[PDB]
């Protein structure tokens, strides 16, 4: 398997086609974004860390019964994945108050959410991923009621599986974002799951070990990403 | 039934208690708000026009089977209503793109929405009525899943009724907001329906005849309100 041509690139990854019409190659670059693309910086080892982090997590979700895009890793920064007809809606689950929920509602950061909250956001950098809801998906044809219901079911299952996984690693899964796509008509988990798209707090100290370190100028971004990778059991070198 | 004392005064109306623990007096003032209370201005006849406009609309909705708060008109600006345990969530139906939808999604104004959209906003002027969804209602306990579903059901029914009503009046019901409350356990329509909380365009010229005239300083605010009153056949004098 080899990259055929660059299809398109986002804020952090490059998507390539392959000789196989149903397979794509995803490249995790060192580009790290904030403000939905307004601020982007490069961190060495970032793409590699996230590529291996994503493989590990998706592997765990797949074992739990969650259908994923993953085929295999091709290098430190690339992975072969099924070509998915992506639903341009980001699925977010919040176990504790943080980020936009805090700014938006004025809720105290760290408050535990029971049951957890579920947010739907439209993928539109220009508009800073505006919040939408189920009626929006039907009215604008982003995804059917049945597929959306599947997306929510799978997102919540992922939450259950990962909360345990991170707790086992002395980490608190605060919130996270998932993106799904259709493969031959079925809902499949695509994109990625990494510290770029989730908030992870050390269980005993509450120290942030995710992209917030970049969003909020705390420094030590990659060091934190790698610390979490190591706690999970991932060998970086 | 008469006013006893002021319980509280909102951006546009004043609520009074009565000898009856289950009845309140709503007083529509001439106060007209924009920016969620940031900019307020007074217009003569405004309170009276909306008070009577509201009674008329509530009546039409009642005759359609929608349970409402309304008891009776008391004066040009006052009406008697059932005391409701208000749900702090604004319910919005959008038939055509306008206002915050256009602002949030960068979508074009006037675009027809099929089916119509349904937005839920937390009632909090301080935070500018932030958009929420059903999960927030469950987690923060603003309203039971059952009652919420009834709120949406009634709102959509109100839309079916009023679209017909306004269309016959040569007008386009672009969007609108409703507030519900609990009365002895049952979900009841409260607050008001007027040009203050709805968008109404002339079917032929698409001229805005609602509070956007105030929001956008287009002049002729009440003239437009009364024009709508006349097309509906609302007695004002
Ligand atoms: N398996 C897949 N098939 C097709 N597109 C995918 C797949 N997984 C992810 N994508 C898309 O590829 C892009 C990944 O690049 P990224 O830099 O994350 O983009 P963005 O700027 O939207 O965050 C996204 O648009 C994502 O939806
Ligand atoms: N039937 C009712 N019973 C109790 N409260 C009501 C009823 N109808 C409306 N209210 C509440 O009374 C207030 C009406 O006044 P208004 O000036 O519109 O207020 P606000 O500035 O809060 O929007 C609102 O807070 C509304 O929720
Ligand atoms: N990574 C992204 C993006 C994005 O990249 O557009 N949107 C949300 N998220 C992730 O979802 C959670 C909630 O994000 P917000 O608090 O900003 O809504 C966080 O873990 C975040 O990293
Ligand atoms: N009047 C209000 C309020 C309010 O007063 O807070 N919130 C929504 N609305 C009405 O709902 C529709 C959508 O409003 P937005 O476009 O602001 O979301 C409009 O008809 C508006 O007047
Ligand atoms: Mg992305
Ligand atoms: Mg995004
Ligand atoms: Mg986003
Ligand atoms: Mg009001
Ligand atoms: Mg409001
Ligand atoms: Mg509002």
**Chain A residues 169-228 with CB within 8 Å of chain B:** none
Residues B191 and B237 in one domain: no
Is the CB of residue A123 below 6 angstroms from any atom belonging to ligand 1? Answer: yes
| B72 and B143 assigned to the same domain | no
Same domain, B21 and B78: yes
∠B63-B69-B73 over CA atoms, to 5°? 85
Residues of chain A with C-beta less than 8 angstroms from the C-beta of B112: none
Enumerate residues 134 to 163 of chain A having a beta carbon within 8 A of any beta carbon in chain B: 134-136, 138-139
Entry resolution (Å): 2.0
- Say which experimental method was used: X-ray
CA-CA distance, A220 to B97, in Å (whole number)? Answer: 44
User: Beta-carbon neighbour count of residue A128 at 10 Å?
Assistant: 15
In whole angstroms, give the CA distance from residue A82 to residue A59: 14
**Cα-flanking dihedrals φ and ψ of residue A7, to 5°?**
-80, -55
Answer for the pair B46, B30: CB distance below 8 angstroms, yes or no. yes
Q: Give distance in angstroms: CA of B177 to centre of ligand 4.
A: 6
The SS3 of residue B164 is helix
Q: How far is the CA of A150 from the centre of ligand 1 (A)?
A: 20
> Domain of A192?
85-220
List, as one string, the DSSP characters of B19-30: SSTTEEEEEE-S
Residue A117's closest chain B neighbor by CA? Answer: B135
Whether residue B188 contacts residue B182, with contact meaning beta carbons closer than 8 Å, is answered with: yes
Neighbours of A199 (CB within 10 A): 22
Element spanning A60, H or E: helix A46-63
Distances in whole angstroms, Cα of residue A225 to Cα of each of A44, A109, A199, A209, A220: 12, 21, 11, 6, 9
The secondary structure element, H or E, covering residue B183 is strand B180-183
Q: Are residues A154 and A197 in the same domain?
A: yes
Distances in whole angstroms, Cα of residue B162 to Cα of each of B54, B60, B78, B171, B174: 12, 8, 23, 10, 11
CATH code of the domain containing B29: 3.30.200.20
Q: In this structure, are B123 and B210 located in the same domain? A: yes
Look up residue B147 and give its two tokens: 């009652």
Residues B216 and B137 in one domain: yes
Distance in angstroms (rounded) separating the CA atoms of residues B237 and B225: 14
Which tokens is B202 given? 């002339």
**A115 upstream amide cis, omega within 30 of 0:** yes
Largest Cα–Cα separation, chain B: 50
For residue B122, the chain A residue with the least C-alpha distance is A105
Q: Which B-chain residues 57-86 have CB contacts (< 8 A) with chain A? A: none
Whole-angstrom distance, CA of residue A216 vs CA of residue B99: 32
Q: How far apart are CA A204 and CA A182, in angstroms?
A: 39
CA distances from A104 to A116, A174, B94, B97, B121 (A): 17, 17, 22, 23, 11
Within this chain, do residues A112 and A208 fall inside the same structural domain, yes or no? yes
The span from the CA of A166 to the CA of A155, in Å, is 16
Q: Tell me the C-alpha distance between B107 and B96, whole Å.
A: 11
Residue B141 φ then ψ, to 5°: 60, 40
Report the b/e string of A160-184 with b at 16+ CB within 10 A.
ebbbebbeebebbbbbbbbbbbbbe
Closest C-alpha to ligand 1, atom 6: A191
Half-sphere exposure of A165 toward its Cβ, with a 13 Å CA cutoff? 24
Which residue in B31, B42, B74 sits closest to B55, CA to CA?
Answer: B74
Same domain, B102 and B192: yes
3-class DSSP assignment, residue B195: coil
Same domain? A122 vs A203: yes
Nearest chain B residue to A127 by CA distance is: B105
Kindly state the helix (H) or strand (E) to which residue A51 belongs, with its residue range.
helix A46-63
Residues A124, A155 within the same domain: yes
Question: What's the number of domains chain A is made of?
Answer: 2
Could you tell me where the DSSP H helices lie in chain B?
46-62, 99-105, 134-139, 145-168, 212-215, 221-232
Q: Under DSSP, is residue B64 helix (H, G, I), strand (E, B) or coil?
A: coil
Same domain, A53 and A165: no
Q: Which residues partner with A24 through β-bridges? A: A17, A81
CB A109 within 8 Å of CB A97? yes
Instruction: For residue A135, give the nearest of B118, B130, B136 by CB distance.
Output: B118
Measured CA distances, B198 to A117, A153, A189, B156 (Å): 30, 35, 40, 14
Both A4 and A72 in one domain: the answer is yes
Distance CA B90, CA B121 (A): 5
Tokens linked to A13? 């990854």
| DSSP single-letter state for residue B65 | T
Q: What's the CA gap between A174 and A69, in Å, rounded? A: 24
CATH of the domain at B116: 3.30.470.20
| CB B32, CB B47: distance < 8 Å | no
Name the helix (H) or strand (E) containing A113. Answer: strand A112-122
């Amino acid at each position: 398997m080899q990259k055929q041509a660059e299809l398109y690139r986002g804020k952090a990854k490059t998507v390539y086609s392959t000789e196989n019409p149903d397979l794509l190659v995803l490249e995790f670059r060192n580009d790290t974004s904030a403000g939905d693309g307004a601020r982007i910086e490069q961190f060495d080892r970032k793409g590699m860390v996230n590529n291996k982090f994503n493989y590990f997590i998706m592997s765990k979700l797949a074992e739990a019964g969650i259908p994923t895009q993953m085929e295999r890793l091709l290098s430190d920064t690339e992975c072969l994945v099924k070509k998915l007809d992506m639903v341009p809606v980001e699925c977010v689950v919040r176990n504790r108050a943080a980020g936009s929920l805090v700014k938006r509602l004025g809720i105290e950061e760290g408050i535990e959410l029971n049951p957890p909250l579920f947010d739907l956001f439209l993928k539109n950098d220009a508009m800073h991923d505006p919040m939408v809801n189920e009626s929006y998906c039907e009215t604008f044809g982003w995804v059917s009621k049945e597929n959306l219901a599947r997306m929510k079911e799978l997102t919540y299952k992922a939450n259950d599986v990962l909360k345990k996984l991170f707790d086992d690693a002395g980490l608190i899964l605060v919130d996270f974002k998932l993106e799904f796509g259709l493969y031959k008509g079925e809902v499949v988990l695509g994109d990625e799951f990494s510290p770029d798209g989730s908030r992870l707090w050390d269980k005993e100290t509450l120290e942030k070990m995710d992209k917030d370190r970049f969003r909020q100028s705390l420094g030590g971004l990659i060091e934190a990403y790698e610390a979490v990778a190591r706690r999970l059991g991932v060998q970086l070198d």
